[PDB]
Design a protein around this ligand. Structure first.
Ligand SMILES: O=C(O)c1cc(Br)ccc1N[C@@H]1CCCNC1
Ligand SMILES: O=C(O)c1cc(Br)ccc1N[C@@H]1CCCNC1
Ligand SMILES: O=C([O-])c1cc(Br)ccc1N[C@H]1CCCNC1
Ligand SMILES: O=C([O-])c1cc(Br)ccc1N[C@H]1CCCNC1
Lengths: 153, 151
């Protein structure tokens, strides 16, 4: 039905999608300004770690600071094979993609990291309130030369 | 068009609901939700290769084994995401239950999961589970390395 309320939901979804697109395509020195796509108190980070607990970066300015470190850790990172999924919630999107780049972590040899990824993006007032990355940490272990435990099946 | 797609999405959504709430002995018949050539399985493994179970009858054979390995498994905290494709859904949930593998001490496995469901003709054509394999290592008493993350 073509009502004001359905139009507002569609418009929100359309603006939000453009922001998810911009986010996934941000490369190089532009990564230092990606934090500006977040709400002041927005959160980003990695939900799948070896420890089992998320590594959550809280607040737009914290996200900006961490982006400096990750530009050294992942100096040429690119996302590839990007698929964006809109949902019933105009303020919630999922993304499936791959990613590849050098990995340069303190205390490890320099490596090449490739993985498959799922991302969750929640919006409030047109800016990103929560971004969460999901991946298989065993692939990152391989990239760092960390022996991967194996489950006998 | 738009009416057929809304119906397709509603029908598929009920199948995702049914799949997610299937517990106990009913797990032996969940394969019936799949196309004859449907694939299900685990996309996040220690090897980096998926464990892909191809075909409705293979899916049913594998459910007998997983009922021994995960005898009381339950999915919780279920959130279903519809998409712009009426035949593609994502689910975010938790899951827990005893884990009883050959050759490892019996444990209690809990994880956070994302599931992908793609449909064809109102049945499941592809289901993929994504989780953190490190939590499954822990459940089995397998040592997990620690990545130095410092700051
Ligand atoms: O790509 C960025 O600019 C970025 C920014 C912050 Br802040 C944290 C991590 C980042 N990149 C990694 C690349 C490898 C996969 N995990 C995400
Ligand atoms: O739940 C089932 O009936 C089931 C059926 C098949 Br065939 C394969 C695995 C199954 N369960 C595991 C439980 C732990 C998390 N991954 C899925
Ligand atoms: O490893 C990841 O893909 C990752 C993801 C987000 Br999000 C934040 C930091 C990440 N890695 C850090 C580890 C410590 C050195 N700096 C890079
Ligand atoms: O480990 C999982 O969560 C899992 C998921 C899917 Br799908 C199929 C089989 C699984 N595990 C097997 C391992 C060997 C003993 N039988 C259980």
């Amino acid at each position: 039905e073509n009502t004001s309320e359905n139009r507002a939901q569609v418009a929100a979804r359309q603006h939000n999608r453009k922001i998810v697109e911009q986010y996934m395509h941000t490369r190089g020195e532009a990564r230092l300004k990606r934090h500006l796509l977040f709400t002041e108190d927005g959160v980003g980070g990695l939900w799948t770690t070896d420890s089992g607990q998320p590594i959550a970066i809280r607040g737009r300015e914290k996200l900006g600071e961490h982006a400096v470190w990750s530009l050294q850790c992942f100096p040429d990172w690119v996302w590839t094979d990007i698929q964006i999924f809109e949902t019933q919630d105009p303020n919630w999107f999922w993304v499936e993609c791959r990613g590849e780049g050098a990995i340069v972590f303190p205390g490890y040899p320099r490596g090449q990291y490739r993985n498959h990824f799922l991302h969750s993006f929640r919006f409030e007032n047109g800016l990103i309130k929560e971004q969460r990355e999901f991946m298989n940490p065993c692939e990152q272990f391989r990239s760092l030369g960390i022996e991967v435990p194996e489950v006998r099946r």
